[PDB]
Copies of this chain bind each other. A is one copy, B any other.
Amino acid sequence: DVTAVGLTEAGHAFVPAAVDLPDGQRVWTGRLSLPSYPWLADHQVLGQVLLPGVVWVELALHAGHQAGCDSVDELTLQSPLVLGASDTVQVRVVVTETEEPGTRTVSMHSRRDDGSWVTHAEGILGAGGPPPEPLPEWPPTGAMPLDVEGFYDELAAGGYHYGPQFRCLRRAWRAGEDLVAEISLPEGTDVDAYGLHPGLFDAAVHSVACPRLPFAFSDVRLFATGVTSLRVRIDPQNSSWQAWDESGLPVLTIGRLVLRSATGARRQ
């Protein structure tokens, strides 16, 4: 119970404590390791366990909401975080007020014991945004069912080995020039301490493949927490995402997402 040491319970699985500072700064803190979250081993690229980049967006959405900034105006990923089998890593989310109210900087960092701080993401938290649009029918129509059989075996062949907690893609269609998909977590996935569980958040992004890593995010908003199943619409003409729950209520919008390509401890 962190209030006994003058901190605030922060209500997130990855950053359970928050440290208000006289800076106008607020810092969310946690410890990441595979024994604490074994399902993190289900995100392995080229034999390395990497923290999914969408984890840093999820943390920004959580910190920004707690700070009054319901929008991730901008988040840019930098160095990846590789989790060894033995590794334990301190994590920080640092939110800093600016000279313009309603706009705050955010940065994400980690540190291993015998090591220095590493910056994993930097960005800007903002107020509000465009309202989401409704889901008038599902699936969209004139939409052709796509064969997603062995979709994950295909990704594995290109080096992206998605484990049980990340194999969330269930059905997909081509809808005009857009991609639409049903994506859902395995049954019994605990999502209480997340805004959007990383495995479902990641499958929302990696479904664009019907094998790359997210790089830069613009205008991300989360409208609902605790969602375990999504209906997703992806538009590559400005690489944007909309997600609704099974009843069509809005869950997530990404105004723009740009991807990128491929150090680290040794495997096994």
Contacts and interface: CB of A to CB of B under 8 A. Distances in A.
A111 interface: yes
A91 B3 CA distance: 11
A39 interface: no
A5 B12 CA distance: 11
A31 to B, nearest CB: 4
A125 to B, nearest CB: 18
Contact of A22 (B4, B21, B30, B119): B119
A5 B27 CA distance: 12
A6 B109 CA distance: 12
A244 B50 CA distance: 55
B19 A31 contact: no
| Chain A interface mostly | strand
A20 interface: yes
Nearest to A31: B6
Nearest to A14: B6
Nearest to A22: B117
Given A2-B2, A92-B6, A29 B19 contact: yes
A62 to B, nearest CB: 15
B6 A5 contact: no
List 7 tightest A-B contacts by C-beta distance, closest first.
A22-B117, A5-B17, A6-B90, A6-B31, A6-B29, A22-B109, A6-B30
Interface of A: 2-7, 15-17, 19-22, 27, 29-31, 90-92, 94, 107, 109, 111, 117, 119
Given A6-B17, A6-B30, A7-B90, 16 more contacts: A2-B2, A2-B17, A4-B16, A4-B31, A5-B7, A5-B16, A5-B30, A5-B31, A6-B15, A7-B29, A19-B19, A19-B27, A22-B94, A22-B107, A22-B111, A22-B119
